[PDB]
Amino acid sequence: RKKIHQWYYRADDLEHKTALLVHLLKQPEATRSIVFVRKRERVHELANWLREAGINNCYLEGEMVQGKRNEAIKRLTEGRVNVLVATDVAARGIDIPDVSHVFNFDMPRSGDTYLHRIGRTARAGRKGTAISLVEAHDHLLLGKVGRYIEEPIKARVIDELRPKTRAPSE
Amino acid sequence: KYDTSELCDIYQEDVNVVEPLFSNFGGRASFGGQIITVKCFEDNGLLYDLLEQNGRGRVLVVDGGGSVRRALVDAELARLAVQNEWEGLVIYGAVRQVDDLEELDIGIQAMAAIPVGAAGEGIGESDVRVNFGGVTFFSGDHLYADNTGIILSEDPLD
Amino acid sequence: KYDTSELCDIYQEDVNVVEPLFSNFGGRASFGGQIITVKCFEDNGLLYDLLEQNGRGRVLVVDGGGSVRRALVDAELARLAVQNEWEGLVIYGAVRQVDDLEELDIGIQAMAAIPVGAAGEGIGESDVRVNFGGVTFFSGDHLYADNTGIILSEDPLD
Amino acid sequence: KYDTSELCDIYQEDVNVVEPLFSNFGGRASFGGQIITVKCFEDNGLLYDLLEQNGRGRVLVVDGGGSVRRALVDAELARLAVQNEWEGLVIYGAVRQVDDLEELDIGIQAMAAIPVGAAGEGIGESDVRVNFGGVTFFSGDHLYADNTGIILSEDPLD
């Protein structure tokens, strides 16, 4: 069973957490990313948030009539776009190709969900990266998930963007 | 809104009938949809992930291992399902806070009530083949239920 | 108006009490009369035959093998019983379309609910001793039943 | 007044849960209080001596042996329970006159209904430890029950 690079960054603010992604998406490494979210509402915004930063991001949320769901998907497999934002439902029966990055903007309660999200990345061979961004309300959830899966997710820090409050209790 | 007897009368052997192990605990007398399946045991972290999503036209089918030690669904998690328009829930397990569940516009069938909640470690697997009541469920099957029983087919019906 | 618990107090040994295996499914909560017994299994050809006949003052006691894989009574068959004035039905077996049954002016006591109809072949036997729930039934015995339980005597009571 | 699921959330392990063998037959959906225990079998002489005393804030908990052949609580005796302001009754055994019991402002949890009444001789013990449903019971303890289930604790909750 597969194997992928996995990292996480803890965050203070929603605002921080979304600059973290912004920074992380503007990297040459980033190629075809999908970013998951939890709430319905947050798909629309985070998509805005992204352009402004200067990243064409396309947003796909689970009411969309299936035609739109294809017009969204087609832009991404076309270089036009390399960021898709969605929820777990919004992207259920879709295969997208040659993904390289999966992001958990919101953490899932279960490692089952987690595993399906990062299951998106390729298998082309060349080996994708799953990065979680954890707000302090997600900390437990990051641990519960880690234990679900074989092993924990190693922490990282972006030098410039840096957590100005302490790590949560346990 | 659905009649499982009339359906069996029509489809005959194109449906499979679950053994009479369950009863209604929700506010909707009957219901039906595409199934999504879960295998889990006295834990519901994953059921919160699934029911947080939109499920209009969908039923959550849960292999809870038949446990009546621990409630998988309680009012909180039922209000959350209702809010995301989930047709109904079929739980091979126990349910909880029955008086609150009956006043909700969702279909729930389950085996028994027990007041102790499940854990929330997130342990469980989803979209898996599961078995109970003499029927096998898998994601994409269609389930129809009323106060007479539960039936399931591969393809929609009417 | 039948109180099976009152009756037990009065006639004592002279009544036999059936095991707590059943539940009300029909429109009447209490009911009684002079039975006519039936032995069958996952078939109701015979039931259609007898209920096509008049039954004022009569209960149909059906030994269905205890099956809950196949329903012996659906709405049609019960509508049948009601237009022929039958006091009620006791089915050591399954019933069907419970929602429709609660509405019909007949007593129904059975064991469970399963969406599958019985077969219509007619394989069975009527007017014969049946036995179940710890009690023997012959045609011309008298039966009294309500929400609390079922009792049987050879003579009439009141 | 009582929601047993919330209580389990709050008190976690200070609470023992009874197995889901019971159901409500009385008018009160949920009830709770300090408990007196009684041990007997198919005889309720003790229950009469006991329910004559007053019992506001008290709950009677009966190891009836689990027998469902003879009913420990009929309408007569439930009334005498209401008269003396008793919170509710818990019977590991059978009750009677289900239709009368639901109209009565008390709580009643039991296993089944059977129209034969219990003897009255007086044989039994009270204020002894009793065991059923995987919970063990001493007088002086505290029980809270609703439609979902029954829970027990050493010290009073809230």
Residue numbers in the entry:
A (entry chain D): 219 to 388
B (entry chain A), C (entry chain C), D (entry chain B): 2 to 159
Task: Reproduce the article's own wording on this structure.
As an inhibitor of RNase E, RraA has widespread effects on transcript levels in E. coli, although its physiological role in ribonuclease regulation is debated. Surprisingly, in vitro RraA does not inhibit the catalytic activity of RNase E directly, but appears to act indirectly by occluding RNA binding regions in the C-terminal domain of the ribonuclease. We have previously shown that RraA can directly interact with RhlB, and it is possible that RraA plays two distinct roles in modulating the degradosome, by inhibiting both its ribonuclease and helicase activities. We present biochemical and structural data to characterize the interaction between RraA and SrmB, and provide structural data on the interaction of RhlB with RraA and compare the two complexes.
The crystallographic asymmetric unit contains a single torus-shaped trimer of RraA bound to one SrmB RecA-like α/β sandwich domain. Following close inspection of the electron density maps it was clear that the RecA-like domain resolved in the crystal structure corresponds to the CTD of SrmB (residues 219–388). The CTD has a typical DEAD-box protein-fold and engages the outside rim of the RraA trimer, such that only one RraA protomer is engaged with the SrmB CTD. There are no significant structural changes in the RraA protomer that contacts the SrmB CTD compared with the two protomers not bound to SrmB. The last 56 residues of SrmB corresponding to the CTE, which are predicted to be natively unstructured, were also not resolved in the final model, and this may indicate that this region is indeed disordered. Inspection of the interface between SrmB and RraA reveals electrostatic complementarity formed by a positively charged patch on SrmB and a negatively charged cluster on RraA. The interface involves mainly salt bridging interactions of side chains and hydrogen bonds between main chain atoms. Most of the RraA residues involved in the interaction with SrmB are conserved and two of these residues (Asp-50 and Glu-53) were predicted earlier to be involved in RraA interactions with other proteins. Closer inspection of the superimposed helicase structures reveals that bound RraA partially occludes the RNA binding surface of SrmB. Based on these structural overlays, we propose that RraA can influence SrmB activity by sterically inhibiting substrate binding and preventing the enzyme from adopting the closed conformation required for ATP hydrolysis.
